[PDB]
């Protein structure tokens, strides 16, 4: 319990999200909540890059170009929310966007290409089983490299847990639960 | 080579009634979609697993008279066995309005087995907890949830579990159509 506010982790994010959104020509309303939520000081340097990766994913793969969102009947401006809070005895961190959602079709194609599953087993996979493929080491693009697989490995190294939720054209929500002690 | 799932379903109503009677449980058993077709190669493999799920619902799910009353629930419990085609899969569901899977019990067993520690246990999602039931050798015993999963997978199928405390449990199995 040598704690510090998660703001030490969150502070650099607004400017980075702003620049990233500009680089990929996306309109992003970035909201951070609960920056006062405290966490183990030893988590600060390990959780920073993983969270940044999730934010990048939201802006790059999630939030759609203004013209695409309109065709979908959604506001031109996309919304990306990073939040932290205390739940029970954990620090819960969420990264949520109202983007296009994870393309499960593509994940299955990747799973098959990487020999992680036979095509005959792909047809009956549940949504959660499909999304879980993102946590298999080596699944992310081969760039110290980033990727959801690395995010999960880091979260597990902190004795924590991670879950993903997503609905086509609705959005994506990643939740990380870290132990306080 | 397709046959109606009634090939598998027909013996369940009598077996459910018999089970409920022996276990002193009041159960209204509802079977739906008996005409749903599935590959003939699945028939001799899915029978025992499904019966085990029905058995689980009656034994571990539906609570005894006094307990349901205490929870504000009708004395007669409900057990629904369903079959249908969804997407391009045969979907079979087993649902009860019983006590729900005891997630704390699982967590305690996980800690005892040394698979998880106290701190980690508190971070687990409900699906992660329920999932331990699929781990070979995790539970008792010789059909177990781990055996049900293996058989389903061997048919290139998938299985998932959903449960809410004191609400009930629902197990879904998806089998290939092609
Ligand atoms: N927020 C999101 N919205 C939509 N798709 C996403 C999101 N996050 C991840 N994805 C999808 O999941 C796949 C994997 O991301 P990741 O594990 O970071 O690997 P990579 O470097 O290969 O993209 C992505 O390539 C993208 O298709
Ligand atoms: N429908 C259900 N409602 C409540 N608990 C259940 C249900 N199905 C299974 N369980 C719980 O999950 C644990 C194991 O199920 P399983 O592996 O099928 O074994 P078994 O019935 O032989 O103990 C059970 O011991 C019980 O505690």
XYZ file of C-alpha atoms and ligand atoms in Angstrom:
413
model
C 0.000 0.000 0.000
C 2.397 2.673 -1.188
C -0.372 4.257 -3.293
C -0.567 7.175 -5.725
C -3.411 8.577 -7.863
C -3.778 6.997 -11.298
C -3.479 10.533 -12.689
C 0.265 9.811 -12.852
C -0.709 7.289 -15.549
C -3.602 9.213 -17.155
C -2.087 12.716 -17.418
C -0.218 12.279 -20.714
C -3.219 10.734 -22.503
C -5.388 13.735 -23.582
C -2.623 15.225 -25.785
C -1.652 11.838 -27.222
C -5.275 11.014 -28.086
C -5.706 14.471 -29.614
C -2.683 14.023 -31.875
C -3.550 10.431 -32.802
C -7.093 11.428 -33.740
C -5.688 14.201 -35.929
C -3.225 11.822 -37.600
C -5.965 9.320 -38.485
C -8.528 12.029 -39.314
C -11.128 11.009 -36.730
C -13.295 13.250 -34.535
C -12.846 12.063 -30.960
C -14.503 13.260 -27.784
C -12.024 11.886 -25.172
C -13.239 11.593 -21.582
C -11.202 10.516 -18.565
C -12.997 9.781 -15.277
C -11.728 8.995 -11.798
C -8.151 10.229 -12.217
C -8.031 10.427 -8.400
C -8.422 6.655 -8.044
C -5.371 5.334 -6.234
C -3.335 2.271 -7.171
C -0.109 0.515 -6.154
C 2.779 2.804 -7.166
C 4.610 -0.169 -8.657
C 1.807 -0.540 -11.244
C 2.308 2.928 -12.735
C 5.216 2.090 -15.068
C 3.847 -1.286 -16.159
C 0.264 -0.305 -16.999
C 1.027 2.841 -19.004
C 1.909 1.388 -22.400
C -0.802 -1.301 -22.285
C -3.484 1.349 -21.686
C -2.052 3.538 -24.422
C -2.306 0.624 -26.819
C -5.992 0.158 -26.013
C -6.609 3.869 -26.615
C -4.779 3.718 -29.938
C -6.886 0.704 -30.933
C -10.071 2.634 -30.202
C -9.050 5.605 -32.356
C -7.572 3.514 -35.161
C -9.792 0.428 -35.383
C -12.874 1.571 -33.457
C -14.091 5.123 -34.108
C -15.201 5.374 -37.745
C -14.630 8.333 -40.113
C -17.314 11.030 -39.707
C -18.956 10.080 -43.019
C -19.224 6.425 -42.026
C -20.730 7.185 -38.615
C -23.435 9.346 -40.217
C -24.386 6.573 -42.647
C -24.737 4.376 -39.558
C -27.015 6.877 -37.850
C -24.487 7.755 -35.167
C -23.181 11.222 -34.197
C -20.243 12.357 -36.411
C -18.051 12.685 -33.315
C -16.986 9.420 -31.705
C -16.615 9.061 -27.944
C -13.699 7.364 -26.166
C -13.876 6.917 -22.391
C -11.051 5.961 -20.017
C -12.173 5.411 -16.438
C -10.845 4.104 -13.145
C -12.531 3.332 -9.838
C -12.335 1.124 -6.758
C -14.496 -1.987 -6.722
C -14.358 -4.265 -3.700
C -10.597 -4.301 -3.161
C -9.584 -3.784 -6.782
C -8.858 -0.914 -9.123
C -11.073 -1.289 -12.169
C -9.962 0.362 -15.414
C -12.191 0.593 -18.488
C -11.463 1.721 -22.041
C -14.679 2.156 -24.021
C -15.525 3.493 -27.485
C -18.789 3.730 -29.460
C -17.074 2.643 -32.671
C -17.617 -0.082 -35.264
C -16.872 -2.929 -32.879
C -14.360 -5.744 -33.242
C -14.626 -7.560 -36.571
C -15.148 -11.135 -35.385
C -15.158 -12.412 -38.968
C -11.596 -11.189 -39.387
C -10.485 -12.604 -36.029
C -11.684 -16.067 -37.063
C -9.842 -15.726 -40.382
C -6.701 -14.828 -38.414
C -7.190 -17.641 -35.916
C -7.414 -20.122 -38.776
C -4.433 -18.629 -40.616
C -2.301 -18.866 -37.473
C -3.209 -22.517 -36.940
C -5.060 -21.695 -33.717
C -8.196 -23.415 -34.941
C -9.569 -25.573 -37.734
C -12.241 -24.083 -40.006
C -14.643 -26.848 -38.933
C -14.521 -25.572 -35.353
C -14.902 -21.916 -36.329
C -18.607 -22.121 -37.197
C -19.773 -22.964 -33.666
C -17.536 -20.535 -31.744
C -19.324 -18.232 -29.296
C -18.660 -14.484 -29.394
C -16.557 -14.661 -26.219
C -14.501 -17.547 -27.581
C -13.825 -15.490 -30.714
C -12.762 -12.401 -28.769
C -10.560 -14.537 -26.492
C -8.312 -15.230 -29.491
C -6.982 -11.682 -29.067
C -5.367 -12.839 -25.817
C -3.328 -15.668 -27.352
C 0.401 -14.815 -27.425
C 1.614 -13.998 -30.916
C -1.871 -13.200 -32.225
C -1.147 -9.467 -32.616
C 0.839 -8.135 -35.538
C 4.541 -9.077 -35.297
C 6.067 -5.532 -34.931
C 8.742 -5.238 -26.615
C 6.011 -5.144 -29.256
C 2.475 -4.133 -28.323
C -0.801 -5.953 -28.927
C -3.795 -7.203 -26.950
C -1.852 -10.398 -26.258
C 0.874 -8.361 -24.558
C -1.750 -6.329 -22.669
C -3.173 -9.549 -21.223
C 0.277 -10.881 -20.337
C 1.092 -7.637 -18.479
C -2.247 -7.648 -16.633
C -1.670 -11.255 -15.572
C 1.859 -10.297 -14.442
C 0.205 -7.845 -12.048
C -1.995 -10.679 -10.699
C -5.002 -9.083 -12.398
C -7.688 -9.956 -14.961
C -8.940 -8.582 -18.291
C -12.209 -8.955 -20.206
C -13.530 -7.676 -23.526
C -17.031 -6.833 -24.706
C -18.118 -5.739 -28.180
C -21.162 -5.423 -30.440
C -20.971 -4.822 -34.187
C -21.480 -1.140 -35.034
C -22.089 -0.405 -31.340
C -18.611 -0.297 -29.812
C -15.961 -1.940 -27.671
C -15.327 -2.062 -23.942
C -12.161 -3.450 -22.350
C -12.109 -3.896 -18.559
C -9.013 -4.446 -16.438
C -9.198 -5.457 -12.781
C -6.034 -5.078 -10.705
C -5.566 -6.208 -7.079
C -4.868 -3.523 -4.475
C -2.798 -5.823 -2.252
C -27.701 -37.200 -43.163
C -30.089 -35.407 -40.864
C -32.626 -36.635 -38.316
C -34.998 -34.799 -35.936
C -33.532 -34.216 -32.480
C -36.526 -36.123 -31.092
C -34.256 -39.146 -31.655
C -32.481 -37.821 -28.551
C -35.346 -35.969 -26.818
C -38.106 -38.600 -26.679
C -36.809 -40.376 -23.542
C -36.231 -37.168 -21.539
C -39.749 -36.384 -20.291
C -40.103 -39.710 -18.434
C -36.517 -39.552 -17.150
C -36.991 -36.004 -15.866
C -40.202 -36.884 -14.015
C -38.456 -39.906 -12.481
C -35.490 -37.778 -11.419
C -37.575 -35.035 -9.829
C -39.586 -37.594 -7.895
C -36.511 -39.373 -6.529
C -34.907 -36.052 -5.556
C -38.086 -34.601 -4.061
C -38.195 -31.587 -6.395
C -41.252 -30.020 -8.023
C -40.421 -29.549 -11.688
C -42.382 -28.374 -14.715
C -40.363 -29.705 -17.650
C -40.739 -27.880 -20.972
C -39.295 -29.401 -24.187
C -39.232 -27.309 -27.371
C -38.089 -27.855 -30.947
C -38.146 -31.657 -31.048
C -38.412 -31.509 -34.860
C -35.121 -29.609 -35.190
C -32.685 -31.533 -37.419
C -29.061 -32.376 -36.630
C -26.419 -34.653 -38.150
C -27.102 -38.326 -37.512
C -23.486 -38.672 -36.359
C -24.309 -36.512 -33.333
C -27.234 -38.554 -31.960
C -25.356 -41.360 -30.148
C -22.871 -38.847 -28.685
C -25.082 -36.053 -27.341
C -27.589 -38.162 -25.407
C -25.648 -38.769 -22.200
C -24.249 -35.234 -22.004
C -27.694 -33.632 -22.260
C -29.149 -36.001 -19.675
C -26.328 -34.967 -17.343
C -27.243 -31.311 -17.789
C -30.906 -32.087 -17.043
C -29.763 -34.047 -14.011
C -27.632 -31.107 -12.838
C -30.603 -28.727 -13.147
C -32.818 -31.008 -11.064
C -30.216 -31.867 -8.416
C -28.096 -28.714 -8.075
C -30.418 -26.144 -9.633
C -34.047 -26.356 -8.572
C -34.220 -25.802 -4.820
C -36.321 -27.776 -2.303
C -39.812 -26.455 -1.486
C -38.879 -24.472 1.634
C -35.909 -22.758 -0.027
C -37.859 -21.519 -3.052
C -40.552 -20.078 -0.780
C -37.905 -18.327 1.292
C -36.645 -16.720 -1.922
C -40.114 -15.572 -2.995
C -40.299 -18.095 -5.830
C -43.196 -20.393 -6.838
C -42.910 -23.931 -5.352
C -42.842 -25.497 -8.815
C -39.487 -25.017 -10.536
C -39.084 -24.662 -14.297
C -36.723 -26.703 -16.501
C -36.573 -25.880 -20.210
C -34.849 -28.023 -22.845
C -34.742 -26.363 -26.266
C -33.473 -27.038 -29.779
C -33.444 -24.808 -32.863
C -31.322 -23.598 -35.752
C -29.598 -20.245 -35.241
C -27.108 -18.745 -37.659
C -25.733 -21.878 -39.217
C -25.618 -23.947 -35.980
C -27.961 -26.294 -34.134
C -28.564 -24.593 -30.774
C -29.521 -26.656 -27.727
C -30.300 -24.932 -24.434
C -30.873 -26.259 -20.914
C -32.272 -23.689 -18.495
C -33.570 -23.786 -14.921
C -34.840 -21.085 -12.550
C -32.990 -22.533 -9.570
C -30.317 -21.349 -7.123
C -27.734 -20.605 -9.797
C -24.157 -21.917 -9.824
C -22.348 -21.213 -6.534
C -19.472 -19.040 -7.757
C -17.909 -18.599 -4.318
C -17.700 -22.365 -3.971
C -15.732 -22.532 -7.240
C -13.379 -19.746 -6.182
C -12.700 -21.518 -2.894
C -11.948 -24.754 -4.748
C -9.678 -22.857 -7.159
C -7.697 -21.377 -4.273
C -7.428 -24.736 -2.507
C -6.087 -26.346 -5.692
C -3.528 -23.542 -5.829
C -4.694 -22.428 -9.288
C -5.469 -18.930 -8.069
C -4.607 -16.885 -5.004
C -6.771 -14.727 -2.796
C -5.839 -11.424 -4.443
C -6.252 -12.779 -7.985
C -9.561 -14.430 -7.084
C -11.107 -11.044 -6.324
C -10.276 -9.799 -9.835
C -11.855 -12.670 -11.778
C -14.889 -12.010 -13.971
C -17.976 -14.193 -13.562
C -17.334 -16.005 -16.853
C -13.786 -16.788 -15.758
C -15.159 -18.296 -12.547
C -17.879 -20.348 -14.248
C -15.223 -21.537 -16.707
C -13.351 -23.534 -14.045
C -16.184 -26.050 -14.297
C -14.814 -27.050 -17.713
C -11.333 -27.786 -16.351
C -10.681 -31.546 -16.379
C -10.423 -32.840 -12.824
C -11.657 -29.606 -11.244
C -14.924 -31.052 -9.877
C -16.048 -34.263 -8.064
C -16.607 -37.821 -9.484
C -18.505 -40.453 -14.387
C -19.910 -37.612 -16.464
C -18.847 -34.133 -15.406
C -19.021 -30.711 -17.031
C -15.480 -31.314 -18.251
C -16.682 -34.463 -20.024
C -19.662 -32.647 -21.525
C -17.313 -30.038 -22.976
C -14.917 -32.599 -24.412
C -17.699 -34.517 -26.167
C -19.218 -31.340 -27.581
C -15.827 -30.160 -28.870
C -15.184 -33.573 -30.449
C -18.259 -32.977 -32.592
C -16.719 -29.628 -33.530
C -19.273 -27.975 -31.267
C -19.065 -25.308 -28.567
C -20.511 -24.930 -25.082
C -21.050 -21.958 -22.797
C -22.564 -21.366 -19.366
C -24.572 -18.459 -17.996
C -25.739 -18.133 -14.373
C -27.131 -15.581 -11.915
C -27.236 -16.155 -8.167
C -30.689 -17.297 -7.049
C -31.998 -16.662 -10.561
C -30.929 -19.841 -12.335
C -28.591 -21.406 -14.876
C -28.498 -21.772 -18.633
C -26.114 -23.998 -20.580
C -25.882 -23.551 -24.349
C -24.445 -26.012 -26.827
C -23.856 -25.159 -30.483
C -23.257 -27.957 -32.991
C -22.303 -27.565 -36.661
C -24.939 -27.757 -39.400
C -22.784 -28.056 -42.519
N -11.487 -0.884 -30.015
C -11.463 -1.695 -31.113
N -12.442 -1.524 -32.063
C -12.450 -2.310 -33.173
N -11.535 -3.281 -33.415
C -10.579 -3.432 -32.459
C -10.449 -2.692 -31.274
N -9.405 -3.082 -30.542
C -8.897 -4.059 -31.294
N -9.549 -4.316 -32.450
C -9.284 -5.335 -33.553
O -8.607 -6.429 -32.949
C -7.478 -6.751 -33.716
C -6.193 -6.756 -32.812
O -5.597 -5.671 -32.059
P -4.219 -6.065 -31.342
O -4.152 -7.257 -30.449
O -3.856 -4.768 -30.661
O -3.287 -6.329 -32.614
P -2.653 -5.646 -33.990
O -1.180 -4.998 -33.934
O -2.444 -6.836 -34.870
O -3.762 -4.836 -34.491
C -7.160 -5.465 -34.399
O -6.262 -5.697 -35.464
C -8.542 -4.909 -34.760
O -8.975 -5.536 -35.952
N -27.812 -26.133 -13.050
C -26.963 -25.975 -11.999
N -27.372 -25.183 -10.940
C -26.545 -25.008 -9.875
N -25.309 -25.570 -9.786
C -24.938 -26.343 -10.845
C -25.682 -26.599 -11.998
N -25.041 -27.395 -12.853
C -23.897 -27.611 -12.216
N -23.770 -27.013 -11.013
C -22.638 -27.026 -10.004
O -21.430 -27.269 -10.726
C -20.711 -28.284 -10.079
C -20.400 -29.456 -11.061
O -21.208 -29.954 -12.150
P -20.554 -31.218 -12.890
O -19.142 -31.140 -13.405
O -21.600 -31.501 -13.959
O -20.641 -32.301 -11.716
P -21.659 -32.997 -10.596
O -23.249 -32.918 -10.825
O -21.387 -34.460 -10.792
O -21.116 -32.518 -9.316
C -21.770 -29.046 -9.346
O -21.169 -29.854 -8.353
C -22.723 -27.954 -8.853
O -22.208 -27.434 -7.638
